[PDB]
């Protein structure tokens, strides 16, 4: 339950499936709303209950309010710390593009990983989490582009 990146798993009567990823920071677990839909999370022996969420931002926090507040500088390369199902964590560096919306520009990464990678953290060069991966769009040729989704602290 210490700081770090975690897989979000589900199991019924047989094996387990990875449905997402999240970040533990300052005693709060951060992931994307579509990963858990607000369901409680087991962490070893304990139960983590959702504390805050927002379906439109596609974010959820457990144990306390959203803690991640680093922002993409709009200029520099970033790293996705991808935690794909069945694979160990790995870093991919990229220069974001931009989702241009009526309410402003959002950094966006043209990186394509399985659905259960949703919630993987995107990092600045200091290792701070500037957002989570996995809410995005496909373009005409089918390629996937994810927003750099960050909440408010």
């Amino acid at each position: 339950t210490t700081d770090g990146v975690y897989r979000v798993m589900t199991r019924r009567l047989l094996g387990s499936t990875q449905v997402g990823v999240g970040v533990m920071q300052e005693g709060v677990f951060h992931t994307m709303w579509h990963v858990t839909k607000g369901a409680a999370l087991r962490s070893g022996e304990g139960r983590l209950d959702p504390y805050w969420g927002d379906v439109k931002q596609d974010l959820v926090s457990y144990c306390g309010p959203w803690k991640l507040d680093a922002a993409w500088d709009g200029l520099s390369e970033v790293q996705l710390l991808a935690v794909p199902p069945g694979e160990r964590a790995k870093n991919i560096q990229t220069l974001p593009g931009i989702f241009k919306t009526k309410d402003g520009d959002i950094g966006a990464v043209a990186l394509d990983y399985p659905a259960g990678t949703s919630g993987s953290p995107i990092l600045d060069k200091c290792g701070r989490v500037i957002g989570l991966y996995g809410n995005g769009v496909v373009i005409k040729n089918g390629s996937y582009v994810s927003a750099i989704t960050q909440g408010k602290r």
Partner: protein, 40 residues
């Protein structure tokens, strides 16, 4: 449905990491359910 978490690593930047992906500039809309879509 037992949903549970398991630690997967430390959060750090990797020096000399592999670089991939383009930098698309896309016009998009965000609906109230959290879905992004391309503006036609």
């Amino acid at each position: 449905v037992d949903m549970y978490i398991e630690r997967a690593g430390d959060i750090t930047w990797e020096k000399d990491a592999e670089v991939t992906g383009n930098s698309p500039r896309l016009d998009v809309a965000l609906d109230e359910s959290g879905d992004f879509s391309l503006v036609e």
